[PDB]
Amino acid sequence: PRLICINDYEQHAKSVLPKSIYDYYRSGANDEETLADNIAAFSRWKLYPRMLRNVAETDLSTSVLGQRVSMPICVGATAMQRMAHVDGELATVRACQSLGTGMMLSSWATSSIEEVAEAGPEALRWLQLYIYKDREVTKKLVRQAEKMGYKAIFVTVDTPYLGNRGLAAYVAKAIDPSISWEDIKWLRRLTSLPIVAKGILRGDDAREAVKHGLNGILVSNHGARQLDGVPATIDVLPEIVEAVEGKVEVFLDGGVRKGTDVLKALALGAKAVFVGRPIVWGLAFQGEKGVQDVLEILKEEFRLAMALSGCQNVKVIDKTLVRKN
Amino acid sequence: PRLICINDYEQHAKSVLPKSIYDYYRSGANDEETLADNIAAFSRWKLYPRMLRNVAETDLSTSVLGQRVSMPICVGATAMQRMAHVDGELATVRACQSLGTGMMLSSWATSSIEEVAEAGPEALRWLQLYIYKDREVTKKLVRQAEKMGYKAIFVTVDTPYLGNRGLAAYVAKAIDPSISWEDIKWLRRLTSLPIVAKGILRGDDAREAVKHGLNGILVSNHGARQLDGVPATIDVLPEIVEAVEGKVEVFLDGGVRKGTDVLKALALGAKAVFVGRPIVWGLAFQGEKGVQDVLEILKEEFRLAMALSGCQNVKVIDKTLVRKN
Amino acid sequence: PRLICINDYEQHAKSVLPKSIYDYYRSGANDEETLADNIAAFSRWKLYPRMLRNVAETDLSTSVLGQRVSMPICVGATAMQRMAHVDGELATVRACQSLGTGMMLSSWATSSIEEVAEAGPEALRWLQLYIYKDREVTKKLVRQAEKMGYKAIFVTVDTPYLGNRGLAAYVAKAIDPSISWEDIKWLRRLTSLPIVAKGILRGDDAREAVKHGLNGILVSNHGARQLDGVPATIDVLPEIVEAVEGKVEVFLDGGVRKGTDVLKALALGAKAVFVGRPIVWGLAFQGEKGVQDVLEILKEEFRLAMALSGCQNVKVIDKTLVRKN
Amino acid sequence: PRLICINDYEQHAKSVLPKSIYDYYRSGANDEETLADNIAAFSRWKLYPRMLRNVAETDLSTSVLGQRVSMPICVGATAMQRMAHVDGELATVRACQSLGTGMMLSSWATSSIEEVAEAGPEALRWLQLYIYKDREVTKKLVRQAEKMGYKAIFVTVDTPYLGNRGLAAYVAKAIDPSISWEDIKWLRRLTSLPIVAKGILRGDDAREAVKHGLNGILVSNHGARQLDGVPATIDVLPEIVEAVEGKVEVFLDGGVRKGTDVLKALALGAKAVFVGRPIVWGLAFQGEKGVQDVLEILKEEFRLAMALSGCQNVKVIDKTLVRKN
Ligand SMILES: CN(Cc1ccc(F)cc1-c1ccc(C(=O)O)c(Cl)c1)C(=O)c1cc2ccc(Cl)cc2[nH]1
Ligand SMILES: CN(Cc1ccc(F)cc1-c1ccc(C(=O)O)c(Cl)c1)C(=O)c1cc2ccc(Cl)cc2[nH]1
Ligand SMILES: CN(Cc1ccc(F)cc1-c1ccc(C(=O)O)c(Cl)c1)C(=O)c1cc2ccc(Cl)cc2[nH]1
Ligand SMILES: CN(Cc1ccc(F)cc1-c1ccc(C(=O)O)c(Cl)c1)C(=O)c1cc2ccc(Cl)cc2[nH]1
Ligand SMILES: Cc1cc2nc3c(=O)[nH]c(=O)nc-3n(C[C@H](O)[C@H](O)[C@H](O)COP(=O)(O)O)c2cc1C
Ligand SMILES: Cc1cc2nc3c(=O)[nH]c(=O)nc-3n(C[C@H](O)[C@H](O)[C@H](O)COP(=O)(O)O)c2cc1C
Numbered sequence A, B, C, D: 001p002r003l004i005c006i007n008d009y010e011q012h013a014k015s016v017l018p019k020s021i022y023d024y025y026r027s028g029a030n031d032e033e034t035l036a037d038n039i040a041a042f043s044r045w046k047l048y049p050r051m052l053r054n055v056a057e058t059d060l061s062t063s064v065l066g067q068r069v070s071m072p073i074c075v076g077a078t079a080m081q082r083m084a085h086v087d088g089e090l091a092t093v094r095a096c097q098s099l100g101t102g103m104m105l106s107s108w109a110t111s112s113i114e115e116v117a118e119a120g121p122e123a124l125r126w127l128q129l130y131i132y133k134d135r136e137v138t139k140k141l142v143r144q145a146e147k148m149g150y151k152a153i154f155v156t157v158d159t160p161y162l163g164n165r166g167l168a169a170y171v172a173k174a175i176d177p178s179i180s181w182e183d184i185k186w187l188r189r190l191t192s193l194p195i196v197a198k199g200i201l202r203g204d205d206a207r208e209a210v211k212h213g214l215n216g217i218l219v220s221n222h223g224a225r226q227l228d229g230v231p232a233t234i235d236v237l238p239e240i241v242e243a244v245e246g247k248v249e250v251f252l253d254g255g256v257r258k259g260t261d262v263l264k265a266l267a268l269g270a271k272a273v274f275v276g277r278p279i280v281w282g283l284a285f286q287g288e289k290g291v292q293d294v295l296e297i298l299k300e301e302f303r304l305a306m307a308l309s310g311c312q313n314v315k316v317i318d319k320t321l322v323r324k325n
């Protein structure tokens, strides 16, 4: 079928996936108020484009935690990618390598840390981690990330328990509800790799993450799958950027579907954004080629949005490009 | 059928009850503007969860008017529970006893004060009262509550006349439209039991209730069945908490359907919330077991919402967890 | 059929009237934005009821321009009432006489000033006037109102031309687009009867009407049939009440369908409200008896709204009963 | 068919045009958020009409860049008008000549600059220009406008690339993404004709256009066909009027469908407005006569809106006629 935007990929996915699998990937928590708002919030922020700036040579490149990327649009962690396509996380990492962007590998992946590193030897790769009740397993994963050339740890901190959208009983054995800032101190001592706190929604927590020596904040409501009725990530992003006072790089996920979403998040001070569901829809369409397609659509929507806004590169995207109304 | 949230219980009830009985329980007054808003208002208050707090051991227990309860979620007065299930108020009190929460018995109950006390000897039980034109009947009910081990009187003060949603002619003979603060003075002198004013929507009235020696305020619009176009209870709650300056415990009812609703009401300073309609839907499903199910669903939704918000107990639920937008 | 609220009367009218006649009465101007808002605006103003005030003996009576009425709910001018019912304006005046309220007779009535005075000799009656290009006709109507015991002139000032919802060519010959404050000076000199300016939407115009010796302002957008995109009357009412500084009585029409609408308008400082369309729906249902029914439904909805709000009479309806949100 | 407002013309056009052509003319960019808002924004601005002003002799005439026009409603540039009607731009210019208003000829017209000048020798005519990569072509068009009696250049500055709603590859060869304020300096030196910057959405850019010696600003989001998620033109207009401090005439396009839209734009300080799509719907209906019809409907809607607002001419339309709510 002819797919020209990310929503077309989702609609294609709904048509080919078994209902249960599509619903698993689509769903948010409880009444799905935050799921709707992660998208609606982007539409409330309006763009104020500059004219006549010279955008002949647009350059989308940036850096994430000191590593160069082709665009400020990266693949976020999504569990069990082999349910969407046989090649799962291997298809995803190959697409990231082709695009020159980074892949955040899920802790619940249907491919090993080593298998993904060997599929995408030249790809920028990070590991998403939970601090499991079994701290030996946690340490083993960190050491394997270090050995297999992963460049950062994203520690997910918003899942002491799973959100309500016996598989959950199996995950309950793994996920530690007792995790505190003391366990973040332990993780910080365990590795010299950059660590990003994923799932922060409050400025005071972002300040605590900086105080604990972490290297970034991913402003995330876990794709609206954890606590329902939290705000949209794009709405909390300004408070978090303000709170960290430039000490660490702030990222965003939740609701990114269009190039204008990327532009609004960078205008409000995010270094880069991550996409979850759109990658899964790419896999459902055509594995590696479908992920490549989704990433290329986001890249060229972002390039156009930058050019129409008068931005020849990401360094000139400033706060006056957006206002909420 | 498979019912996992309170809305599923309502939909089941609509399917099994005669239309007239379902509509009687569902309805609000006039155009039902307040009925819609009691629910919509909860969705406008957004949650700002703290991460990494240690929520392994969540404790939902609290106290209502000095009596310990298992959770800050209690059964509100709803007339004529035997229309939903043969066991009516006896089923409800048995479920409350099982849960360790309190039951507010309606003045228009299809079970006697004594019958309910003997069904739930160990249950925490309160009596909801009107000051009837017949003050002898009113005094007899208070004395029977005292003798049968009820722990408080909830005096409903928002029904001088019934709201417009010859049965009403029968109730018109009972309900006194002349009640004033002088009649509250009389009730306060009549009993040493704690008295809660149920149906206050204004700070100045809440202050008057404190001045009259009452022991609590239940912020209530009578489930949107009295005056239509009053605000949602969750929207007036902050003014009332502010007005009473900590002198008495403030409760809320109206629109509570989810654990996140409970969390938002406690964040804004309510000690506990009451549920009306959800209990009737529980009865319609399966009597005592259906009421137990609804109360358990609200308990575990509330536990999850607390844990995801970083609250290990009700004492740490604070105003920074919510903001209206 | 069983009709319990004003909307039921409209739905009955749609069912019995020819489509063209129903649409003529229903319609507003252009895209009907103001028609929708005259109703929606009432729902945004929320009521803050006082409890425990003693409302056993509710008294709805008030006065309009020094004449006592049974309720602050009066019949507004609506052209060509004989299209709805054979008895037209005679049915309406008989119903007003039964209710003890006033009737504003249209300048475009299907009954003469004398015929209406003889149908309702004891009814409170006012004449709605245009200053026609033919000033002799205008003066003749005023003199006939004086002689036939009408108690005030309502001069409609918002129709220099008809709004866009060869009949209009006939009315174009009559209606003078040149009318200015100089013509108001002329009308003020012509009669000692109270004169009300009908169709004011701005405080500065209300102040000018006071300066010209007029005796009241009817805040009106002509039932949303003139300029579309003006505000709802309930939203402009506070500015107009503020502007006239108590010098003259301020009335409202536009969108009044319920007793709570009446209560909100009096809380914001209107002395009384007028109803247009609801009267026409009453006529379409059953002539005089249908108008009586509509007026009785508005009376008893208003009584209930007053009693539930803690108001035993109109003199205690105050601004703290309403807030916009 | 019977067409009484601009929306009726669009609905007629949808019925007669091939779907692809209707969709080409209708569409906006991406999710069409700005397309919806260009219309919705007009409805949020409310009118505050003055009564009793004397509007017998309404005069709609004004001037655009020193040239008298019959009304402050002018034809904006729309490419390839021959797809709607065989007579295309020749039909449009003949209608403008009949009305006494101006036509802005598209750079992508299906009629030559000379052909349009000879169809409408007496019509007020302007040329819309791009600064093409081929600056010789650009200069040739300007010289031909000068020679063929066009009175101004509208330089479109919001299209460095086409918005996303191999034809685009053909236009990509022409449209220069490198254009800067240096190229505006060049154009200003090239011609003594008035130059208007079309597509400005920011006050700082409007100030820069004034500094560069341009003679007007057309506040435009290119009919919501360029960057999606910019604000509605009526919402940015006040900032732009404020920013230029009366130095140049400010115009508006985007979403004008009704006479009240024209009145709101002039109240907020626009000298005149331009219409795009409505003209194309006129052509689709009946060529020159259909364009004349649309312009006459906008003229007489505007006259009525002015008269009902108490404005006898455009010079008395002031900012107190509008407020946003
Ligand atoms: C609990 N759970 C998900 C699950 C099962 C197994 C597993 F090993 C990990 C997880 C898991 C996934 C994500 C995250 C996170 O981080 O978002 C975490 Cl914590 C844990 C399920 O219930 C579940 C999986 C699933 C697959 C297909 C279908 Cl049709 C339905 C499904 N439901
Ligand atoms: C008046 N009324 C309710 C009613 C009838 C009898 C009674 F003894 C008490 C009441 C009563 C109920 C609640 C409250 C309160 O506090 O909310 C008060 Cl004040 C009084 C009815 O009209 C009514 C009951 C009813 C039952 C089934 C169906 Cl299908 C329709 C019904 N309508
Ligand atoms: C102009 N007009 C109305 C009209 C025609 C005749 C007349 F003598 C007075 C008027 C008139 C009415 C109200 C007002 C006012 O004050 O609101 C004023 Cl100014 C003048 C019509 O077009 C019209 C009437 C009518 C009847 C039935 C149907 Cl189905 C359609 C209809 N259309
Ligand atoms: C690019 N484009 C439009 C196009 C093709 C050719 C041309 F010479 C000019 C243009 C053009 C039009 C407007 C503007 C502007 O200013 O808004 C600019 Cl820059 C350039 C198309 O894709 C296109 C045209 C068209 C016609 C019919 C149908 Cl059904 C579909 C269509 N699509
Ligand atoms: C199906 C699914 C699986 C997810 N699995 C994980 C996971 O294993 N680890 C994790 O930290 N987050 C996980 N997330 C959250 C994502 O990392 C990301 O925060 C979210 O998808 C971003 O929102 P978006 O889907 O709107 O782009 C998952 C999200 C979805 C939809
Ligand atoms: C069917 C029904 C019957 C009610 N009966 C009573 C009653 O007898 N006494 C009383 O004080 N309130 C009564 N109420 C109001 C409730 O105590 C409570 O304020 C309301 O149900 C709370 O809103 P909720 O239904 O949204 O939870 C009733 C409410 C309903 C829906």
Ligand SMILES: Cc1cc2nc3c(=O)[nH]c(=O)nc-3n(C[C@H](O)[C@H](O)[C@H](O)COP(=O)(O)O)c2cc1C
Binding pocket: C024, C025, C026, C038, C076, C077, C078, C079, C106, C107, C108, C128, C156, C198, C220, C221, C222, C223, C224, C225, C253, C254, C255, C256, C274, C275, C276, C277, C278
């Ligand atoms: C069908 C119709 C006819 C009207 N005719 C007149 C009239 O003859 N004179 C006048 O001053 N206003 C007239 N009005 C305006 C009314 O007096 C009144 O302002 C309006 O109906 C109030 O709004 P409502 O219909 O929502 O109650 C008319 C309104 C309608 C709907």
Ligand SMILES: Cc1cc2nc3c(=O)[nH]c(=O)nc-3n(C[C@H](O)[C@H](O)[C@H](O)COP(=O)(O)O)c2cc1C
Binding pocket: D024, D025, D026, D038, D076, D077, D078, D079, D106, D107, D108, D128, D156, D198, D220, D221, D222, D223, D224, D225, D253, D254, D255, D256, D274, D275, D276, D277, D278
């Ligand atoms: C079909 C179409 C073609 C257009 N072509 C041009 C063009 O050739 N040059 C240009 O400067 N703007 C062009 N525009 C933008 C218009 O000049 C104008 O800004 C826009 O139509 C105004 O919004 P409206 O259509 O809501 O009235 C076009 C707009 C449409 C809808």
